[PDB]
């Protein structure tokens, strides 16, 4: 569940780019067709997003990797 966003700050030391990384990710999970990378509790996209920030498998860098790499999938499918 959700009580604090403490440890999310403990992996992202800005507490503001927490909001942009989280908004980028949860926007990629609501509009885009992607599953969560964490088992959900029938939560919303928000707590799933910050909850993925808790396990550290998403920050700004990995999101750069997926925008670039799925971007090259949009290049390689273009032929």
């Amino acid at each position: 569940a959700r009580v604090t966003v403490q440890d999310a700050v403990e992996k992202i030391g800005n507490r503001f780019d927490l909001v942009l990384v989280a908004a980028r990710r949860a926007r990629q999970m609501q509009v885009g067709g992607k599953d969560p990378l964490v088992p959900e509790e029938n939560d919303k996209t928000t707590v799933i997003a910050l909850r993925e920030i808790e396990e550290g498998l998403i920050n700004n860098q990995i999101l750069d990797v997926r925008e670039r790499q799925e971007q090259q999938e949009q290049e390689a499918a273009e032929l």
Partner: protein, 1337 residues
């Protein structure tokens, strides 16, 4: 879409480009059919379609004809919204002056023409003429004439020479003015005028010219020829209840202007005589000047019911203009309002919320999820389902409000905790349930307070809510590091009843294996809740690297403390729960829990405190009764002796042996002592009321009287209030402001009688009036403070410098009143801490001083710590991170962006609702004596006396820090001196307040030099002794015939020679001022330390804070010496008594007139430093800036207003006051321009000039020599390069007009204008966004 905003004057070409037609007719509506007219104010063919895609004639009722205009009535078929932006115009017949540029005070036209405003008012109102195109005349170009002087000029130079009237003539002057010629001629006169006044007027003139030509303006543009009219939808004409139309003031105004204009054009065709059309143009100018800014002419015109109508200046200015009412604060959808109630069962990351509010708020969410589940096809079917309230949509709402935070607000939203996010849990009922701890943050009791809910719609907003504004985040105030989650009143009663101990009850002294048998005892009803028991407990310490070490013991405690101990998590020592736990104890309990264990166990720990607090406050049952308040029996006798004592003093006044003032002072003193005797009687007879047997004889202990437990817990009230319940209350003040001689001898437990209740009624009414008018100030204070900080975003990581201010713990003159480890705590050091193991480096030069480092500072007794402050932070357009330190709500350094200007100004201005509105030296403790800046001599007896005013007496302790500080006046008889050990409790000084002594320095003879009886000194025989003494008169009492002499005393030897100053070659003669009485007669061989003569002799409320940030020059300013060197006096009362200052090395052109009401500090033989004191009175801020520097004036502010809040005991950490000071002295002026481009006597902001010469440092050339200024907050707000924020603040007219003739352009770089324009704020998340956007351009 767009960057910066530029503003300028209106060309008529630009006006005609804006418009789409000349509005000609004053009738608007037909009101028979509802169509408007051909070309009225409401016009279809100029402004566009009334209804949607239809012409007014009704030709093209189809969307297919979109774009083409019609021919029947010529209405361009478009959207009806196109009638919202299409402006109009009016070709006036006469030229017409704009009223703002006429009467902005200072007038732009007035100093533009070098012409007084009186005459220009006379020109525009047709009661004088004026010259244009003089030539071969005796008539100057600006010469104004009356009508009879126009007759004389009509005879004399009535030839081809011209002269006109009205705005045509002003149009001719501004039309025919050249610019560069007056730039050369008036810079030429800045050379040619030594006059400061002409230098000031002509430098304001030179700013208007050199800014006017640089701007895209023309002078004749100010006279409005073509008046633009407002689009009609913005000035609508609604029906009232009936077939009438509610009036707009605008349409009345334009109705008058179009009437007067059309009658004027008809008077121009028919060619009436000049006096009729003079009156017609005069009424037109009154009309347009009424429309632009009504009321700036001395009488307004009234529309109906005798009421001043609302011009466009009243469409912008004031509390109901667009900035106050429709731009900064907007009404918002997705919101609701309701009464709050408690619901204690909630956790603090959730709040209660009613069901019907939820179903009405969350309608689009319910609609979307019904489309998701397919239980509804269209928007009307879903809308009918949520109108129907089916049992499926409650499950849908329970889906969508699973993790959806909401933003609650309370209406007086003082500091930043006023909106907090929560999660809803749906409630059977109609009121918001709200978690109780949050009440203390909201300042919200449950007496009927109403709180509003808002809903974040977008996903970023939900993440901003849960990440930042969730209530678990806000546990520490930005004002101070204290917890704002303080358990307020019931829960602390449950604890102070829980953790208490009586000596004899159930289960005394037994042994129990842990707290689980304790709670098993208490729920069984076999042992007492409070009876002292040895138990076994097991605690944990995180001394290792986060590793919790176990230990167990058999503590002496009570049962309730064990039941409390089952809640407290692992990281705490048991001594946190071993005391009685009042309010301060539970507060620092929570604070240590956050400092040690972090956030999550602190939060859920606080919840478990609250639940067990109501469980045991509930189960305890602490009532209140009339038997609970105890009258002391000894009250009546102290009343009796009080009446006896005022009976005796009254008897002494009966025959008249004491004065009325003596009776008043004596009576108030004996009532005060009597009152405190009664207070000790009731306080003892409450606090040790209980006497119980211990199983032996007896013992006394603390009392279970309930009103004492509510007192000593600190839940409600104090010893003063519970004093007022039992003992007699007070000496109530009077409406005059004095005190009342008959105190209320009775309390609230007995009845009041009548007149005592009358006087107490005065006390209450004065209190409540102070609350209302007090808040009426306080909102305006916080208003100005946030409208002067406003701009200030933590934007860099380091300045990389080493300036700063010096924190020392303040010592007001007694005990230390704010220690070092509160002022220093959480701020980044300027350089390293040089330990007093001296040349030992305790902390480095950039380390944040958290609690460990502050303890290491504490053990080594660090005296003064220099530290990086925001006032000296060398950040450009911002504040670096390493000059601010802690957020005080996050236990680390500040993040880059969270705008400390606003959190500063709210955190300063919020406790203003809790403020108020309306000999010798006796040392205390035992230590070493240090003196500061001493110039002294040992007298004939051996006591030390000081010949310098500015010597400060410090009591250093045993270690080396200062622990007392004192002022030692001029010629004060000390008992001890430097390096001398004094005893704890010694009188260490003396002086006479009714004597300014003129003490000696060495010994020798004294000759009365220039002391002639009748001219400088006068003969007065002493009436009481016989050894008379000549009295030195002052300046004005003697006549001028013998005033030019200066009486002095020169130490001379047995030859008459010069006995000099020890060390220099000047004699020690004392030029005597007035009211000096030299007691020692002529030729007295004198000693050291003896008086050569005797010269005998506020409000700290909220307006103190206001006038500090306003920085007013106070009543009698303590004047200072601008520069060092020896000084003397000048001319006797040429208005004032002049000074003559003389430096040693530099020149001395500076001297200054002095008001002779001031007993000066300095003499003719006295040499000062620059910025040294000359007189007494308050210490005015400007001179403290321009003499003693920046650090002195910010230090004076923060210690001053910190004393103001510190007296009432509300903590504000100093950085907020410091950063408001940083916004105060942001502007500056120039001493020498150098290779820059500024005018020398010009004001510009320090940031822009610091980057100006800093980039002239990029070349080898020398930039400027700046000089900082100190503006008040309400003027430094308005003098801001962004004009739009200054339009949002006060005096909108002056801001916009100075913007207009300035041609000012605004790149906006700020907060409030971005609230205006409605984009992302460059504050937090939007500061990352402007990192992106400024990173791209």
């Amino acid at each position: 879409e767009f960057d910066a905003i530029k503003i300028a004057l209106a060309s008529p070409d630009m006006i005609r480009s804006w418009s789409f037609g000349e509005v000609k007719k004053p009738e608007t509506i037909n009101y028979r059919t509802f169509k408007p007219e051909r070309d009225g104010l409401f016009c279809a063919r100029i402004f566009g379609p009334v209804k949607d895609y239809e012409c007014l004639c009704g030709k093209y009722k189809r969307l297919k004809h979109r774009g083409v205009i019609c021919e029947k009535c010529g209405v361009e078929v478009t959207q009806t919204k196109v009638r919202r932006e299409r402006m109009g115009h009016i070709e006036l017949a006469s030229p017409t002056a704009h009223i703002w540029f006429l009467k902005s005070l200072p007038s732009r036209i007035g100093l533009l023409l070098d012409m007084p405003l009186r005459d220009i008012e006379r020109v525009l109102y047709f009661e004088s003429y004026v010259v244009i195109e003089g030539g071969m005349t005796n008539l100057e170009r600006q010469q104004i004439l009356t009508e009879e002087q126009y007759l004389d000029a009509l005879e004399e130079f009535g030839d081809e020479f011209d002269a006109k009237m009205g705005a045509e003539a002003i149009q001719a002057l501004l039309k025919s003015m050249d610019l560069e010629q007056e730039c050369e001629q008036l810079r030429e006169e800045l050379n040619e005028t030594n006059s400061e006044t002409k230098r000031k007027k002509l430098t304001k003139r030179i700013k208007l010219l050199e800014a006017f030509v640089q701007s895209g303006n023309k002078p004749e543009w100010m006279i409005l020829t073509v008046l633009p009219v407002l689009p009609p939808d913005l000035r609508p004409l609604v029906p009232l209840d009936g077939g009438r139309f509610a009036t707009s003031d605008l349409n009345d105004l334009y109705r008058r202007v179009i009437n007067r204009n059309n009658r004027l054009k008809r008077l121009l065709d028919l060619a009436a005589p000049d006096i009729i059309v003079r009156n017609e143009k005069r009424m037109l100018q009154e009309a347009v000047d009424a429309l632009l800014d009504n009321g700036r002419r001395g009488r307004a015109i009234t529309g109906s019911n005798k009421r001043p109508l609302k011009s466009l200046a009243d469409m912008i200015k004031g509390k109901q203009g667009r900035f106050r009412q429709n731009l900064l604060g907007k009404r918002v959808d997705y919101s609701g309002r309701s009464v709050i109630t408690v619901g204690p069962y909630l956790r603090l990351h959730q709040c209660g919320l009613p069901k019907k509010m939820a179903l009405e708020l969350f309608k689009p969410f319910i609609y979307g999820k019904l489309e998701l589940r397919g239980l509804a096809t269209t928007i009307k079917a879903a809308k009918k389902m949520v109108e129907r309230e089916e049992a499926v949509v409650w499950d849908i709402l329970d889906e969508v409000i699973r993790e959806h935070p909401v933003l609650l607000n309370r209406a007086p939203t003082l500091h930043r905790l006023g909106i907090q996010a929560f999660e809803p849990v749906l409630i059977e009922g109609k009121a918001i349930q709200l978690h109780p701890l949050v009440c203390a943050a909201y300042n919200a009791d449950f007496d009927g307070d109403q709180m509003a809910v808002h809903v974040p719609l977008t996903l970023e907003a939900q993440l901003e809510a849960r990440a930042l504004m969730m209530s678990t985040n806000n546990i520490l105030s930005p004002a101070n590091g204290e917890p704002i989650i303080v358990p307020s009143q019931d829960v602390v009663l449950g604890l102070y009843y829980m953790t208490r101990d009586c000596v004899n009850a159930k289960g005394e002294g037994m042994v129990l294996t842990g707290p689980k048998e304790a709670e098993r005892l208490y729920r069984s009803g076999l042992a007492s809740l409070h009876a002292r028991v040895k138990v076994r407990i097991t605690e944990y310490e995180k001394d290792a690297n986060g590793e919790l070490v176990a230990k167990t013991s058999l503590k002496d405690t009570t049962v309730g403390r064990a039941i409390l101990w089952m809640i407290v998590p692992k990281g705490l020592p048991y001594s946190i729960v071993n005391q009685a736990l009042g309010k301060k104890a539970i507060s620092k309990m929570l604070n240590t829990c956050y400092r040690i264990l972090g956030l999550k166990p602190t939060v859920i720990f606080a919840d478990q405190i609250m639940y067990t607090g109501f469980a045991y406050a509930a189960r305890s049952g602490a009532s209140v009764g009339i038997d609970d308040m105890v009258i002391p029996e000894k009250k009546h006798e102290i009343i009796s002796e009080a009446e006896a004592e005022v009976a005796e003093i009254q008897e002494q006044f009966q025959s008249g042996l004491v004065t009325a003032g003596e009776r008043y002072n004596k009576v108030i003193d004996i009532w005060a002592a009597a009152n405190d005797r009664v207070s000790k009687a009731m306080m003892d007879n409450l606090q040790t009321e209980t006497v119980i047997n211990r199983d032996g004889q007896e013992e006394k202990q603390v009392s279970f009287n309930s009103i004492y437990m509510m007192a000593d817990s600190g839940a409600r009230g104090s010893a003063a209030q519970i004093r007022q319940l039992a003992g007699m209350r007070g000496l109530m003040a009077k409406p005059d402001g004095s005190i009342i001689e008959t105190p209320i001898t009775a309390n609230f437990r007995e009845g009041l009688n009548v007149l005592q209740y009358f006087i107490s009624t005065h006390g209450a009414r004065k209190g409540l009036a102070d609350t209302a008018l007090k808040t009426a100030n306080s909102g305006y204070l916080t208003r100005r403070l946030v409208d002067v900080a406003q701009d200030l975003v933590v934007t860099e990581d380091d300045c990389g410098t080493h300036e700063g201010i010096m924190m020392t713990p303040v010592i007001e003159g007694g005990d230390v009143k704010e220690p070092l480890r509160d002022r220093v705590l959480g701020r980044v050091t300027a350089e390293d801490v040089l330990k007093p193991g001296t040349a030992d480096i305790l902390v480095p030069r950039n380390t944040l001083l958290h609690e460990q480092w502050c303890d290491l500072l504490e053990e080594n007794s660090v005296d003064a710590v220099k530290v990086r402050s925001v006032v000296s932070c060398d950040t450009d357009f911002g504040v670096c991170a390493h000059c601010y330190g802690r957020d005080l709500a996050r236990g680390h350094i500040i993040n880059k962006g969270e705008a400390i200007g606003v959190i500063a100004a709210q955190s300063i201005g919020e406790p203003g609702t809790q403020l108020t509105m309306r000999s010798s030296i006796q040392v205390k403790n035992k230590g070493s004596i240090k003196l500061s800046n001493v110039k002294s001599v040992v007298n004939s007896s051996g006591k030390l006396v000081i010949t310098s005013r500015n010597t400060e007496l410090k009591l250093i302790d045993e270690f080396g820090r200062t622990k007392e500080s004192y002022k030692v006046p001029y010629g004060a008889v000390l008992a001890k001196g430097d390096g001398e050990q004094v005893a704890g409790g010694e009188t260490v000084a003396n002086w006479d307040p009714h004597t300014m002594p003129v003490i000696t320095e060495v010994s020798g003879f004294v000759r009365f030099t220039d002391m002639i009886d009748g001219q400088t000194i006068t003969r007065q025989t002493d009436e009481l002794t016989g050894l008379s003494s000549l009295v030195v008169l002052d300046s004005a009492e003697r006549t001028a015939g013998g005033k030019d002499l200066r009486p002095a005393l020169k130490i001379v030897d047995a030859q008459g020679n010069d006995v000099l100053i020890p060390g220099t070659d000047m004699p020690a003669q004392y030029f005597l001022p007035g009211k000096a009485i030299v007691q020692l007669e002529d030729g007295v061989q004198i000693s050291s330390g003896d008086t050569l003569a005797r010269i005998p002799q506020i409000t700290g409320g909220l307006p103190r804070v206001a006038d500090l940030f306003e920085a007013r020059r106070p009543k009698e300013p303590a004047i200072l010496a601008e520069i060092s060197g020896i000084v003397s006096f000048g001319k006797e009362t040429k208005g004032k008594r002049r000074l003559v200052i003389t430096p040693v090395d530099g020149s001395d052109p500076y001297e200054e007139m002095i008001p002779k009401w001031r007993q000066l500090n300095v003499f003719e033989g006295e040499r000062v430093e620059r910025g040294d004191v000359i007189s007494d009175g308050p210490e005015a801020p400007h001179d403290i800036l321009r003499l003693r520097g920046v650090h002195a004036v910010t230090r004076y502010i923060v210690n001053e207003v910190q004393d103001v809040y510190r007296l009432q005991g509300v903590k504000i950490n100093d950085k907020h006051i410091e950063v408001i000071v940083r916004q105060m002295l942001r502007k500056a002026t120039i001493v020498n321009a150098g290779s820059s481009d500024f005018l020398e006597g010009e004001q510009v902001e320090y940031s822009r000039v610091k980057i100006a010469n800093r980039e002239l440092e990029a070349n080898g050339k020398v930039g400027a020599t700046y000089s900082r200024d100190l503006l008040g907050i309400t003027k430094a707000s308005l003098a801001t390069e962004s004009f739009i924020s200054a339009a949002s603040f006060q005096e909108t007219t002056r801001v916009l007009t100075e913007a207009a003739v300035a041609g000012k352009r605004d790149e906006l770089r700020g907060l409030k204008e971005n609230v205006i324009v409605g984009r992302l704020i460059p504050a937090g998340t939007g500061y990352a966004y402007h990192q992106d956007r400024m990173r791209r351009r």
